[PDB]
Design a protein around this ligand. Structure first.
Ligand SMILES: [Mg+2]
Ligand SMILES: [Mg+2]
Ligand SMILES: [Mg+2]
Ligand SMILES: [Mg+2]
Ligand SMILES: [Mg+2]
Ligand SMILES: [Zn+2]
Lengths: 85, 104, 66, 85, 52, 105
RNA sequence: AAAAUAGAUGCGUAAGUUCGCAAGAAGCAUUGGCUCUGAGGGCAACAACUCAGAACUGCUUACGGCGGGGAAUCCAACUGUAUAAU
RNA sequence: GUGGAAAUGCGGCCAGGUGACCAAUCAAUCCUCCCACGGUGAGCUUUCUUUUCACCAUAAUCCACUUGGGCCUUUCGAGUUGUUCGGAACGGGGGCUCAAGAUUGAAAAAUGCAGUUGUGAGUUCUAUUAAAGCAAAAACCUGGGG
């Protein structure tokens, strides 16, 4: 089964070029990865449309990033709001 | 036995499902298969779950159904899951009890 | 913390579905609550925890005996 | 169960017992399948299909060339009167 | 086609179709809406209402 | 240690969820027929809403056994006909104004 | 243009490569009939039909259907679209 | 209005639901097909053929009442063909309830047909791509409140 290298990208066969797959592959996996829920303490988030992350556990929906539940930009804003508290 | 449509419509759309039926006369006859609906649900924002005491009556027959066929005899009975009611009965009580304390 | 030695020292119920019931009986000798608890769930143990005059420690776990 | 054939309306005594088979073998009639008569009653402990006797009859009438003269029918649950047109 | 089961109801209830069956004897009471039927097993009570 | 009799509970299940109720009898020990602690519970089967207004002030009451987990104990504290008057009149006095105020879910 | 390849099974499969491929690469091989065997389940206290094997035996290599392959260069990366009527 | 410890059972406005939205697959029935049995009719019949063929039907409507899911309650395993799940309650006992379904019967044998069930298969209907997320609304329903 397992690909030596390209995983989810294996479906694309020998096309689209190596780099673009390499770069699609990161976003592709975080996109289908289950991302950690602060609410449940559970890996549980899964995306259901770009920027939408349903929680498999407690019904819920974080907004979040496209291919990832949290943007690096967002890491700043949340604490920065915490510090203003 | 090959069958053909009997209602004036002739497309294999979802609302026109048909049931093949051997008859007492030994005909094989398509019959309209009812457009079953899923029944009452708790609201979509509350996870959208099928309610327990309620039947999936088509509104075509929902008018003729007994009232309790579409509900339970509990507050929010045809609307909310029992947990969802209890979520409120708690949330009503506990939230007011904190407000009653914020006067002190 | 010290509640870990509690695990071997004595009894402990776990989870709100029965940590609340140790709390009605007042069998509860303490009640830990992880931060993760939703506020209306957590308030509910927080409210029994007042009626039982049980010790409360925001950190669900209840230690009936120890 | 005794099968029968009411010939009374219109050899055939003989042809049957030579041409009936309690198992694979033909014409070897064990005491458990006695036959005889204007009715070829066929007594048996054996599990024959009833229409087998409607069959040996037609296979008989096709020999005597009667089958376009006369016609078998189940006039009872366990009988075959031989009629006509 | 609802089926009335007990006799007490049936004696309470236009033109009625008796139907003998082997091992049966139905009484198909027609009415404005339903064709009520009353099954009646043993015959001793079938004509017990038939002669009614 | 507080499901003491006279304690008022708000029912959280059945037809009567959201209804207030004083515990009457309370038996915390599990029964051979009630594998659960089960308070008796008179309740408001109808909160209150010259004789033009009198029907409106009538209080309903229900006596019931109830599993402890199917009602909510409160801060507050306090034979279907007999129970009905002792917090009918208890109402007319206004000793427990909140008790005869129903929850607004 | 025609021929040619051809199904399935078991083997075997190069360069090059974006490591997915190339690949059905290529390349040999066995295949019928028949009489048997073995394997693979269900429900209590009878049901499939695939695979496998074995003898014996047959061939006129005897339906239909079914890739020809390889080595290179140019162009375009790819699937796609598109001058209906050169 | 009312039973039930509970899931829940029976008897103006406001908010929610149905409408209402997926390929497949899996499962049930449906259906078709096959087989086995049995009947009935027909046909083959030089020979052979316990044989070949056909048929053996069950409408809506209603009444009493196994599989999948949700839930109540009570005292690491669970799970699928499959990418799951579990103290935010898993499993086990009992219960509730939905969705299909089965059987009991009413229809309905006064019909059909012509001079029987069961068993197997297929069909049927009831995730993935996604920077793609896969209509609306009347009707209607239920509630909260009056
Ligand atoms: Mg050519
Ligand atoms: Mg290589
Ligand atoms: Mg091109
Ligand atoms: Mg052109
Ligand atoms: Mg029917
Ligand atoms: Zn979560």
């Amino acid at each position: 089964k397992r690909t030596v290298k390209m995983g989810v990208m294996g479906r694309y066969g020998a096309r689209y070029g190596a780099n673009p797959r390499k770069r699609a592959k990161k976003l592709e996996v975080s996109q289908h990865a289950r991302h950690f829920c602060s609410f449940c303490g559970k890996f549980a988030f899964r995306r259901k449309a770009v920027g939408i992350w349903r929680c498999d556990g407690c019904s819920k929906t974080m907004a979040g990033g496209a291919y990832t539940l949290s943007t690096p930009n967002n890491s700043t804003v949340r604490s920065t709001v915490r510090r203003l508290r | 036995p090959r069958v053909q449509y009997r209602r004036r419509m002739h497309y294999a759309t979802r609302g026109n499902r048909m049931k093949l039926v051997r008859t007492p006369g030994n005909r094989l006859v398509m019959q309209k298969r009812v457009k079953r609906s899923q029944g009452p649900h708790t609201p979509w924002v509350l996870g959208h779950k099928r309610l327990a005491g309620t039947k999936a009556l088509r509104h075509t027959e929902a008018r003729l159904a007994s009232r309790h066929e579409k509900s339970t005899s509990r507050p929010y009975g045809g609307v909310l899951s029992h947990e969802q009611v209890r979520d409120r009965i708690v949330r009503a009580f506990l939230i007011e009890e904190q407000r009653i304390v914020k006067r002190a | 913390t010290k509640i870990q030695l509690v695990m071997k020292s004595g009894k402990y119920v776990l989870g709100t579905k029965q940590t609340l019931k140790t709390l009605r009986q007042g069998r509860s000798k303490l009640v830990v609550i992880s931060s993760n608890c939703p506020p209306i769930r957590k308030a509910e143990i927080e409210y029994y925890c007042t009626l039982s005059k049980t010790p409360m420690h925001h950190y669900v776990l209840s230690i009936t005996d120890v | 169960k005794v099968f029968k054939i009411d010939c009374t309306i219109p050899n055939f005594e003989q042809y049957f017992q030579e041409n009936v088979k309690l198992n694979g073998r033909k014409g070897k009639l064990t005491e458990k399948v006695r036959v005889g008569l204007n009715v070829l009653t066929i007594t048996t402990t054996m599990a024959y299909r009833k229409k087998y006797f409607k069959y040996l009859t037609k296979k008989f009438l096709k020999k005597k060339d009667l089958r376009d003269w006369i016609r078998i029918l189940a006039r009872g649950k366990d009988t075959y009167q031989l009629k006509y047109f | 086609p609802r089926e009335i089961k007990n006799l007490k109801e049936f004696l309470a209830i236009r033109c009625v179709k008796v139907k003998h069956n082997p091992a049966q004897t139905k009484f198909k009471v027609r009415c404005s809406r339903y064709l009520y039927t009353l099954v009646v097993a043993d015959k001793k009570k079938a004509d017990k209402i038939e002669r009614s | 240690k507080f499901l003491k009799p006279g304690k008022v509970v708000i029912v959280t299940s059945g037809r009567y969820a959201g209804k207030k109720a004083v515990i009457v009898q309370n038996t915390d020990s599990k029964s051979k027929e009630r594998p659960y602690g089960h308070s008796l519970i008179a309740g408001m089967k109808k909160y209150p809403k010259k004789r033009t207004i009198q029907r409106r002030s009538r209080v309903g009451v229900f006596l019931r056994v109830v599993n402890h987990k199917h009602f909510l104990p409160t801060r507050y504290n306090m034979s279907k006909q007999l129970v009905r008057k002792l917090f009918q009149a208890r109402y007319n006095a206004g000793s427990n104004r909140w008790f005869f105020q129903r929850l607004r879910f």
